[PDB]
Amino acid sequence: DSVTIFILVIHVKPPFKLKPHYEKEMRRQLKMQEDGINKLTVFEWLTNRKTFREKGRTAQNDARDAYKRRKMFDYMLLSAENFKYDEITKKVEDELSSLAKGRAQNLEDELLKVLEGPPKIDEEQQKYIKMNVIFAEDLEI
Amino acid sequence: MYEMFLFNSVNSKITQNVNEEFILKYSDYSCEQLNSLWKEVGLGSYYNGLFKIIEPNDLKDIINQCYIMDDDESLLPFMCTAFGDVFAYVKNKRFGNYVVFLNIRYGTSLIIPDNFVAIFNKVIPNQSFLKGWFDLENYAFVKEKIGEIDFDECYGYFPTLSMGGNESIDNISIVKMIPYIDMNVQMIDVFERADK
């Protein structure tokens, strides 16, 4: 044999809750998730959570988008020949510029706390630990 | 009002022509543009299964715990994509009513003016927008590889993107929609605004 092995036992906080055929489907689908995660390396999973979090960037922003998207609808209902998303967004954008932490994030934290929890675990090492999460059996009713 | 919506849909599958007691079930949470839509368009699959006009109460309890905006009074899910994403009609007297597109894959929210005519007649039959707003460009591709879904199924990622999944077609599996969306809404706390 002659090998060193890193073996991780994290639960999802809070547990998934539930409110006939439905409870079957959700235990069933949570296990599928639970298994799919444990096939991933710590490194893989964290590269995927970083990839997920870089999606999405306020009353004033929503006010901005309100004005822009309301204008496009105007242009669009008016004409009968369709617009292209890339063109029309930049159009209205320069018109306006002429008057201008739940379960999955807890999992990422619970985990990150382990990886630093002494002994600290390094990025290369992460390519060699398997995820070890259990949550599907914790389905609260 | 939705002729131009219904026509560009090839392969439609109405599963339940809409009542009036159905429409009155949601009078407290609906609006006339959406009530007339339920009148012109029944619950079913549209645009090759991509779009599903759903029973709002199937999802309405799942997503009314979703913080979108201050002073939201009600979220009325009325449509779903073939990936589990949710369209809701949101009543808000401070901001004005509006539609939220919740991307269940990326955990994001898109605020859309509550112009159902514009939404259904000129945004949906526009591939630029299916890609630009809803990220549904690869629907054809996904179906070629995974197979076609029924009305109550969708393409789930296992594990989801929010739980560290890859986003390859290797991880997509046809599964029951409603429990999928439920699962995903329980994973992500806030659906942050979509960089758009």
Residue numbers in the entry:
A (entry chain A): 173 to 180, 182 to 192, 199 to 236, 241 to 283, 320 to 360
B (entry chain B): 1 to 196
Question: What's the paper's own text on this?
Answer:
We identify a horizontally transferred T6SS with Ntox15 family nuclease effector (Tde1) that mediates interbacterial antagonism among Bacteroidales, including several derived from a single human donor. Effectors with novel toxin 15 (Ntox15) DNAse domains, also known as toxin_43 domains, degrade recipient genomic DNA. Cognate immunity proteins are encoded adjacent to T6SS effectors and neutralize their activity to prevent intoxication of self and kin. Crystallographic snapshots of isolated Tde1, the Tde1/Tdi1 complex, and homologs from Phocaeicola vulgatus (Tde2/Tdi2) illustrate a conserved mechanism of immunity inserting into the central core of Tde, splitting the nuclease fold into two subdomains.
Orphan immunity proteins co-expressed with the P. vulgatus dnLKV7 homolog Tde2tox in E. coli also formed a stable 1:1 complex, as detected with analytical gel filtration chromatography. We therefore obtained crystal structures of the Tde1 Ntox15 domain in complex with Tdi1, as well as a homologous complex from P. vulgatus dnLKV7, Tde2tox and Tdi2. The Tdetox/Tdi complex homologs exhibit very similar structure despite 51% sequence identity between the Ntox15 domains, indicating a conserved mode of effector–immunity interaction. When bound to immunity proteins, Tde1tox and Tde2tox split into two subdomains. Forty percent (17 of 43) of immunity-contacting Tde1/2tox residues in the effector immunity structures form part of the central core in the globular Ntox15 domain alone structure, and many of these are highly conserved. We conclude that Tdi immunity proteins induce a marked conformational shift in Tde effectors, driving a division into two subdomains with disruption of the enzymatic active site and DNA binding motif.
